[PDB]
Design a protein around this ligand. Structure first.
Ligand SMILES: *[C@@H]1O[C@H](CO)[C@@H](O)[C@H](O)[C@H]1NC(C)=O
Ligand SMILES: *[C@@H]1O[C@H](CO)[C@@H](O)[C@H](O)[C@H]1NC(C)=O
Lengths: 375, 50, 419, 50
């Protein structure tokens, strides 16, 4: 009764510390004599080299999951796509550290992807909750031509339609356009005065510069900014009045990995005690079958509940991602981040700090201004 | 699109509504001259008004 | 400059190599002659695939890689997507594991497959509904990633449709094996035509529940999508006859017919590329090793093959990469659990049928019924104003009854279409 | 037509019998023990609406 799980990690010190962490977790809470075997591999930038290492280390060692961490450099993408694709042959579950892209959310592209970071779709839920608690009905949306942006727009539409409320219109941008001035003007020529930004960092910076040079930073113009659009050039080319969002305990690495490996060990024990388990082929060449425990892992993990994590109970959505994560509303005051609101599940907890708005006003504006220019 | 000078029956009601409801009306004329209903065009599976 | 086609163990290697060699030599000779490097193996291991890709790359910079398969796994499509995201080599999908297209079209991907998307299947289903004059819908779907958008698209289409069929709220099964709410969900539907959007394994249990509740009557009609009934030779006992499905198979096409079309498309793309530019594209010097991000200096082949005509058979691709004029041969389950061709969709993106209405006989249960009451009607007296199908409106009026009549064509032959 | 339950604990035809009725007012002629299971089947099928 020995199970070996491979790990993909960036640096050697991380490998050693995570090996020690999983060895300690093998004895934390309730555990048996032999449950896990500690193995790890380095994060190789070369695709062929990393694929060969994965095949020669994990497949040939009877693994049930892949412990792949986030790329060391956030600037580069280095998306964990090849590992998920290789694990999709036998529906092998994988571990996502902070991969927040919506590409892995759908199961049509990635058959079995599991991550501990909530998707970008939760930004739509945050916006909906803020509108509900601040009485906002008419809202325009600015989404670029991206798969994640389209998914977020669909989530917003399906979350707002249940209250018999529909957005006025949604503008589509492109990754690289520099003449969005016409789109900004046609968005300004609207009844609503609340704008939501959800795009790449460079596009967000460009559109914010266009808004600043077109005098869109005035009073009564509430700006909503996503998680990824508050860094980079945003900290330099953005005045106060920004309603930013940030994940609580998100950038931390070891905070969630221990809980994830504990959940993996518990799932392995449950699978061992449930029924017969099929074993993966030893060599990487010679077998192209499909695991019979593939859907079984999803069935036993989606309904699994574990309160031993640092964030209380652990629950998974229909896409096998983190459910009910902790969010934090970010406000900018003289290029300084100020914490006011937090999210812990269908609740809002504002702090004593006043929420400022663009133009220097200290009162919440209204999005209903009738210009009386009825054609 | 030369400016014309149209008047009649509904103009008085429109002026009264504008006076009593903070409205600033801009009267325009139909470019087609028809009320507009469902019509069939290329890709006739589309119900768009004219 | 070089063409490589991947095959399996279904047929002999020598004849496949010979036919691939003499394919391009049939007509439309290329200015630069191309060769064939055909590799045949039963297994489809990823390491074998990447080694074969590297060998083809070392084969004098092969520009065209035709990938075939014989299994029923969709992960090979993902693996080929990831491979083409770096090798920058266009690949045409053939029969096998690449037939099912379900992955998102990557911006750097160079795939133009022969598969059928869900978007172009809803129109075929609507055309079938119009032909059958069935004005009752029931979108009994299942929660899967990417089905909410399909439901929104179909509801917008039916709302936009002039016919305006009866629409009911989507009564979907929340979670599998509820055993307490499935009965409520099955009681929430009281119609005759039900559309299903699920997988094969869940469709099996859905059909079992329908059999337990008794939803296999004469008036009941069912339509099964392509992804559920893709495997034609495996028919579970819980599938009653009459399951109308729309897909493409090898009844009217062959691997040779597909590879000839693929090589013709590749030749047309090469000709379009040579029309504008006069530079031969070059591949990566190495097989897969790289230390920096890759890029394509010259323009890709996507804008060149937007408009492709092959001997009067326009086989083009959309922006994503889906075909414009697929096959979509309609298949209806036989009384003895077989699949037969009952129409075609390539005829100017329209629907065709053999005019065989009654096929839903009591098979799973034993209860005869007399529902299709045959009626004969004439037009001599001024009591009937029956008129032929008008091209405008919705092929008829909102207040009419479907009819049929044998139209004469020749003074000797008795054959007449049931228009 | 009288849609009656032939034998108790059929488990294969009771669902068909419950699907054969599509009305709102139902009269019962049985015993207490069998009425208990009939009501349980109705609850499973959801026949306790307004
Ligand atoms: C991450 O969380 C763990 C436990 O919550 C803590 O010990 C560690 O210091 C955190 N990491 C950082 C960088 O603060
Ligand atoms: C709207 O009506 C009020 C009277 O209630 C008036 O004081 C105000 O000037 C009006 N606004 C405009 C733009 O005419």
């Amino acid at each position: 009764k020995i199970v070996n799980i491979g790990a993909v990690l960036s640096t050697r010190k991380h490998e050693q510390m995570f090996r020690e962490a999983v060895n300690q977790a093998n004895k934390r809470h309730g555990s048996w004599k032999i449950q896990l075997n500690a193995t790890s591999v380095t994060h190789k930038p070369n695709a062929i080299q990393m694929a060969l290492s994965v095949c020669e280390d994990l497949i040939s060692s009877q693994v049930y999951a892949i412990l792949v961490s986030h790329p060391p450099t956030p600037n580069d993408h280095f998306t964990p796509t090849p590992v998920s694709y290789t694990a999709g042959f036998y529906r092998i579950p994988v571990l996502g550290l902070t991969t927040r892209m919506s590409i892995y959310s759908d199961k049509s592209i990635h058959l079995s992807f599991l991550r501990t970071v909530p998707p970008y779709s939760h930004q739509s839920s945050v916006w909906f909750e803020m509108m509900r608690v601040y009485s906002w009905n008419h809202i325009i949306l600015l989404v670029s031509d991206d798969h994640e942006g389209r998914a977020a727009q669909k989530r917003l539409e399906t979350l707002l339609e249940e209250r018999e409320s529909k957005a006025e219109k949604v503008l589509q941008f492109d990754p690289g356009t520099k003449n969005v001035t016409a789109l900004l003007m046609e968005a300004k020529e609207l009844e609503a005065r609340v704008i939501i930004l959800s795009a790449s960092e460079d596009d967000a910076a460009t559109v914010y510069r266009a808004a600043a040079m077109l005098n869109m930073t005035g009073s009564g113009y509430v700006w909503l900014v996503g998680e990824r659009e508050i860094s980079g050039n945003a900290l330099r080319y953005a005045p106060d009045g920004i309603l930013g969002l940030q994940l609580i305990n998100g950038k931390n690495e070891s905070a969630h990995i221990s809980d994830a490996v504990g959940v993996v060990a518990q799932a392995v024990h449950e699978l061992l005690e449930k029924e017969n388990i099929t074993d993966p082929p030893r060599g990487c060449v010679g077998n192209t079958n499909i695991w019979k425990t593939g859907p079984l892992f999803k069935r036993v993990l989606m309904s699994s509940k574990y309160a031993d994590g640092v964030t209380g109970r652990v629950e998974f959505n229909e896409d096998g991602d983190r459910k009910f994560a902790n969010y934090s509303i970010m406000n900018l005051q003289n290029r300084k981040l100020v914490q006011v609101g937090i999210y812990n599940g269908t609740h809002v907890i504002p702090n004593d700090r006043k929420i400022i708005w663009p133009g220097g006003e200290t009162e919440k504006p209204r999005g209903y201004q009738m210009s009386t220019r009825l054609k | 699109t030369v400016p014309q000078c149209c008047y009649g029956f509904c103009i008085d009601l429109l002026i009264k509504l504008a006076r009593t409801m903070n409205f600033t009306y801009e009267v325009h004329l139909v470019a087609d001259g028809k009320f507009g209903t469902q019509e069939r065009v290329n890709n006739s599976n589309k119900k768009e008004w004219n | 400059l070089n063409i490589a086609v991947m095959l399996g163990h279904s047929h002999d290697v020598t004849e496949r190599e010979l036919r691939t060699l003499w394919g391009p030599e049939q007509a439309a000779g290329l200015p630069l002659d191309v060769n064939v490097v055909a590799l045949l193996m039963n297994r489809t291991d990823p390491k074998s695939l990447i080694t074969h890709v590297c060998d083809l790359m070392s084969g004098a910079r092969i520009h065209g890689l035709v990938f075939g398969d014989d299994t029923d796994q969709e992960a090979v499509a993902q693996m080929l997507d990831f491979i083409s995201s770096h090798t920058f080599v266009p690949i045409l999908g053939i029969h096998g594991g690449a037939s099912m297209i379900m992955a998102d079209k990557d911006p750097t991907s160079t795939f133009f497959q022969f598969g059928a998307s869900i978007q172009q299947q809803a129109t075929v289903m609507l055309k079938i509904m119009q032909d059958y004059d069935w004005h009752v819908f029931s979108l009994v779907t299942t929660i899967f990633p990417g089905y909410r958008e399909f439901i929104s698209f179909v509801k917008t289409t039916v709302d936009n449709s002039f016919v305006g069929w009866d629409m009911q709220n989507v009564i979907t099964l929340d979670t599998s094996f509820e055993d307490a709410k499935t009965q409520v969900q099955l009681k929430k539907i009281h119609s005759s035509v039900i559309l299903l959007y699920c997988s094969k394994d869940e469709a099996v249990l859905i059909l079992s529940e329908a059999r337990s509740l008794g939803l296999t009557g004469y008036d009941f009609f069912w339509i099964v999508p392509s992804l559920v009934s893709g495997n034609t030779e495996l028919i579970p006992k819980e599938f009653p006859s009459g399951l109308i499905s729309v897909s493409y198979d090898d009844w009217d096409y062959s691997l040779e017919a597909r590879v000839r079309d693929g090589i013709g498309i590749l030749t047309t793309a090469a000709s379009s590329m040579l029309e504008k530019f006069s530079y031969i594209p070059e591949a990566k010097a190495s097989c897969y090793g790289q230390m920096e991000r890759p890029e394509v200096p010259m323009h890709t082949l996507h804008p060149f093959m937007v408009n492709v005509t092959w001997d009067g058979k326009d086989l083009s691709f959309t922006e994503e990469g889906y075909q414009v004029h697929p096959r979509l041969v309609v298949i209806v389950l036989n009384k003895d659990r077989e699949w037969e061709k009952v129409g075609k969709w390539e005829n100017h993106t329209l629907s065709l049928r053999h005019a065989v209405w009654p096929r839903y006989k009591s098979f799973s249960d034993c209860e005869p019924d007399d529902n299709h009451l045959s009626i004969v009607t004439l037009e001599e007296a001024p009591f009937v104003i029956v008129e032929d199908i008008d091209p405008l409106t919705e092929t008829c009026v909102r207040n009419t009854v479907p009819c049929r009549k044998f139209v004469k064509i020749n003074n000797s032959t008795n054959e007449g279409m049931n228009v």
